[PDB]
Amino acid sequence: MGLVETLRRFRGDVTLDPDTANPELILSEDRRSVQRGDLRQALPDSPERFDPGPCVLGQERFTSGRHYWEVEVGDRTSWALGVCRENVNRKEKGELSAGNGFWILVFLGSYYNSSERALAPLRDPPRRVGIFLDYEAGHLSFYSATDGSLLFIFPEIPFSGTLRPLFSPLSSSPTPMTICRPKG
């Protein structure tokens, strides 16, 4: 029980916007969990829905200030988390890159190093990821919430207009990606 456990009580709520979700994604009834299946569902289409990008947005809109949120990913060795401009091309077929208004951390595999007999894994993958946004500082950074390690920090970003939190479970898995509710 140290300062980092206490300050994590600043984590805010995020609820997913079902109208933005790629048609392979399912959402929980409380809109805090998302899972990727292997089936394209029959959903009403619109410009707001990610296709073919396997993403969903939070309902929340960032225009200023400091924002922290936590996502349980569990055993996953594949996910993407961060933020994007409200006005991105949600039908983008190529890479979702900083140049097109996507600021996302992507976990696509694991590192090992050569050891005495074999290979050693570097670290347990994070089960819980914290995302920190400081709009005026142009700051976006990602942490392993359980041990407080930095995963990634973007270079200073010249944010303008509205940002949305972005979630992307990159594999099918029995493990939903879950937004952690605020404490109390």
Residue numbers in the entry: 276 to 459
Please give me the paper's original passages concerning this structure.
The tripartite motif (TRIM) proteins form one of the largest subfamilies of RING-type E3 ubiquitin ligases, comprising more than 80 members. TRIM family members typically contain a RING domain usually catalyzing ubiquitin transfer; one or two B-box domains mediating protein–protein interactions; and a large coiled-coil domain region, which is involved in self-association or oligomerization with other TRIM E3-ligase proteins. About two-thirds of human TRIM proteins feature a PRYSPRY domain, also known as the B30.2 domain, in their C-terminal region. All characterized family members shared the same overall PRYSPRY twisted β-sandwich fold consisting of a 7-stranded and a 6-stranded antiparallel β-sheet.
A notable exception was the TRIM11 structure, in which a unique subdomain swap was observed. The crystal lattice contained two protein molecules in the asymmetric unit. In chain A, β-strands 7 and 8, usually located at the edge of the concave 6-stranded β-sheet, were displaced and interacted with the corresponding region in chain B, forming a hybrid β-sandwich. The equivalent β-strands in chain B, however, did not interact with chain A but were disordered, resulting in an asymmetrical dimer within the asymmetric unit. These observations raised the question of whether this domain might form a symmetrical subdomain-swapped dimer in solution. However, gel filtration analysis showed that the isolated TRIM11 PRYSPRY domain is largely monomeric in solution. Nevertheless, the observed subdomain swap in the crystal indicates an increased structural plasticity of this region of the TRIM11 PRYSPRY domain that was not seen for other family members. An interesting variation was observed for TRIM11, however, where two β-strands of the 6-stranded β-sheet showed increased structural plasticity, resulting in this segment either being disordered or forming a hybrid sheet with a neighboring molecule. While this assembly is stabilized by crystal packing, it nonetheless reveals the intrinsic flexibility of the swapped β-hairpin motif in this family member.
